[PDB]
């Protein structure tokens, strides 16, 4: 009751901090145990965190998204954000936010890729894996039922919840495509995996990127038109 109240509230820094504290109190409750029953319970509580992250991304409150990793205790943080996921979470959040907002139509803009260290994380193949692992976790937290009671991805938006999740998960999939096909975008096999995208989605992406490359670093620009050209061919 105390929990379901919070999750249903409008998304603020207050409602976010209290919720994470509750999950952690619940998450902690499994750390003394080390069996298999403990791991599955912990694994669900873990993606309850990512639900809250995915909510913030889809609600255009990215500053709240970064705050999630802060409210999480270090031992819990080591298990929820394993290894290199910890180091690239800042970049993953930005990447997921950028794409999701585009898919929701948000008339731009988004910070540089070479400034927020996102373009840097791309050039490391092991950082792309840790980013991809996070994007995947973002996606599954809103597809699966992480709570024992149904919760809308965006508060108050019940009747359109199935539509929102569909939209968000597609965005999180295209963000996953950018990662896995870095510098191999225009290759035939890479383009075949753009078949999932709606035709309107591609146009929204082509436009938002074409408008996003203006004045940017050449490296980011060439990265973008590799993406755009891959969109224009699918």
Report the interface residues with a second copy, using CB under 8 A. 36, 39-40, 42-44, 46-47, 79, 82-84, 86-87, 124-127, 129-130, 132-133, 136-137, 140, 144-145, 166, 189, 192-193, 195-196
Report in angstroms how near the CB of residue 150 gets to ligand EMC at its nearest.
17
Kind plus residue range of the DSSP H or E element containing 60: none
3-state secondary structure of 158: coil
CA angle (109 as vertex; 53, 135 as ends), nearest 5: 30
- Name which of a second copy, ligand EMC, none residue 196 binds, using a CB cut-off of 5 to 8 Å depending on partner kind: a second copy
Comparison of 82 and 109: residue with beta carbon closer to a second copy: 82
User: Binding to ligand EMC by residue 39, rule CB under 6 A?
Assistant: no
Per annotation, catalytic residue among 59, 97, 98, 223: 223
The answer to whether residue 96 forms part of the interface with ligand EMC (CB under 6 A) is no
**C-alpha 149: how far from chain center:** 22
Q: How far is CA 98 from CA 80, 124, 133, 207, in A?
A: 23, 20, 17, 14
Contact 120, 89 (CB under 8 A): no
- Tell me the closest approach of the beta carbon of residue 50 to ligand EMC, in angstroms: 6
The yes or no reply on residue 126 touching ligand EMC (CB under 6 A) is yes
Considering the complex, what minimum distance in angstroms separates the CB of residue 195 from a second copy?
4
Element (H, E) at 40: helix 36-58
Residue 23 within binding range of ligand EMC, rule CB under 6 A = no
Helix (H, G, I), strand (E, B) or coil at 56: helix
Distance (Å, whole) CA 58 – CA 81: 21
Is residue 218 packed enough to be buried (19+ CB in 10 Å), middle (13-18) or exposed (0-12)?
exposed
Residue 136 interacts with, from ligand EMC, a second copy, none (CB under 5-8 Å by kind): a second copy
Q: Is 97 a catalytic residue?
A: no
Nearer to ligand EMC, 118 or 194 (CB): 118
Can you give the binding site for ligand EMC, defined by CB under 6 A? Answer: 40-41, 43, 46-47, 50, 80, 124, 126, 137
């Amino acid at each position: 009751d105390k929990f379901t109240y919070l999750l249903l509230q409008p998304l603020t820094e207050a409602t976010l901090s209290d919720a994470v504290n509750f999950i952690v109190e619940k998450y902690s409750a499994e750390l003394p145990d080390e069996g298999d029953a403990s791991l599955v319970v912990r694994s669900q509580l873990g993606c309850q965190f990512f639900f809250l992250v995915t909510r913030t991304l889809a609600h255009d409150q990215r500053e709240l998204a970064k705050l999630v990793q802060t409210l999480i205790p270090r031992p819990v943080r080591l298990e929820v954000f394993p290894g290199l996921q910890r180091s690239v979470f800042k970049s993953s959040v930005f990447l997921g936010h950028h794409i999701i907002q585009i898919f929701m139509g948000a008339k731009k803009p988004f910070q540089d890729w070479s400034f927020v260290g996102l373009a840097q994380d791309f050039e490391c193949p092991w950082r792309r894996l840790a980013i991809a692992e996070l994007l995947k976790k973002f996606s599954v937290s809103v597809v699966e039922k992480v709570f024992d009671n149904p919760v809308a991805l965006i508060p108050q938006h019940e009747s359109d919840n199935e539509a929102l999740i569909e939209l968000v998960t597609n965005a999180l999939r295209f963000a996953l495509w950018i990662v896995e096909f870095y510098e191999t975008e225009t290759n035939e096999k890479s383009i075949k995996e753009l078949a999932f995208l709606d035709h309107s989605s591609k146009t929204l992406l082509i436009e938002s990127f074409t408008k996003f490359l203006q004045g940017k670093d050449v490296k980011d620009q060439d990265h973008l038109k590799r993406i755009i050209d891959a969109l224009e061919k699918s």
